[PDB]
Ligand binder design. Structure first.
Ligand SMILES: O=C(Nc1ccc(F)cc1)c1n[nH]cc1NC(=O)c1c(F)cccc1F
Length: 281
């Protein structure tokens, strides 16, 4: 730690405390995350390689005195605070669209290298004054105070052990709908409550929409059978392009669910721009 001065506690991460810190030598301000098996060492080292404009840059990995610290480029806000701050009027749609597009870019990159996030949520989406948004804590999940289930894909909730990059698309779809409506899509407060909120909005899945569902580990023939709601009721006043895209990001069957790369080609992004957010630091 010596080479750093903790300027302040930024928050209580999943894997430990987060500090804003200044490199006593380089002068650079940074995010310092306190988290040791060699596997965790090997995973995090891979992470140093996947550099992308929409991934929070992992500056350094300090394994000293059998402790683990990750050093990340610092950004001044996350999407959760910005949403609360924009509750009154909502985030403008052009900004929502730009955030969605850049996030999809980040995902398409990670996914092309077979790296999933697994835990997307507005808290780990960081933004700057220049209109950029970045995925934070990418890959930390494989490598390793209630954790939110609100963005969890249903195949995870159903006990699927070998899930795909589709889980991140699902989470990002949930975040998309939340930006638009200013309300969490599926605010579950247990794994069953989470699952059943999903069922209530999208319909109880069956073998028609999701072949193999009924054979999943935690699936029960006894689940109530709810009817799917219509999306126009779910995310007004998102336009038809947005709704089409959202519906594809929220497909039950992970194999039907749109990829990040395919989502980038959707006509919703036909008119994408890069607006600057007004944020007060
Ligand atoms: O937290 C960060 N920035 C930030 C600063 C002030 C805020 F109000 C808000 C945000 C940050 N900058 N760079 C990386 C960061 N955070 C993470 O990587 C991170 C983490 F280590 C653990 C959990 C969530 C994270 F986003």
């Amino acid at each position: 730690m010596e080479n750093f001065q903790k300027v302040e506690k930024i928050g209580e991460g999943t894997y430990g405390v987060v500090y804003k810190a200044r490199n006593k030598l380089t002068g650079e301000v940074v995010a310092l995350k306190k988290i040791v098996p060699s596997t965790a060492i090997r995973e995090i080292s891979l992470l140093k390689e996947l550099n992308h404009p929409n991934i929070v840059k992992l500056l350094d990995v300090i394994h000293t005195e059998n402790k683990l610290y990750l050093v990340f480029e610092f950004l001044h806000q996350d999407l959760k605070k910005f949403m609360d701050a924009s509750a009154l009027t909502g985030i403008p749609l052009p900004l929502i669209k730009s955030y969605l597009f850049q996030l999809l870019q980040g995902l398409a990159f990670c996914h092309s290298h077979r790296v999933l996030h697994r835990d997307l949520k507005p808290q780990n989406l960081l933004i700057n004054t220049e209109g950029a948004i970045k995925l934070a804590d990418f890959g930390l999940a494989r490598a390793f105070e209630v954790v939110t289930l609100w963005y969890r894909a249903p195949e995870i909730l159903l006990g699927c052990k070998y899930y795909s990059t589709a889980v991140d698309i699902w989470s990002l779809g949930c975040i998309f709908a939340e930006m638009v409506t200013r309300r969490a899509l599926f605010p579950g407060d247990s794994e069953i409550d989470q699952l059943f909120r999903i069922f209530r909005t999208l319909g109880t899945p069956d073998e028609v929409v999701w072949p193999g569902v009924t054979s999943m580990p935690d699936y029960k023939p006894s689940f109530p059978k709810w009817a799917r709601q219509d999306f126009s009721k779910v995310v007004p006043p998102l336009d038809e392009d947005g709704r089409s895209l959202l519906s594809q990001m929220l497909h039950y069957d992970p194999n039907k669910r749109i990829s990040a790369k395919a989502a980038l080609a959707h006509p919703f992004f036909q008119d994408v721009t890069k607006p600057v957010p007004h944020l007060r630091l």
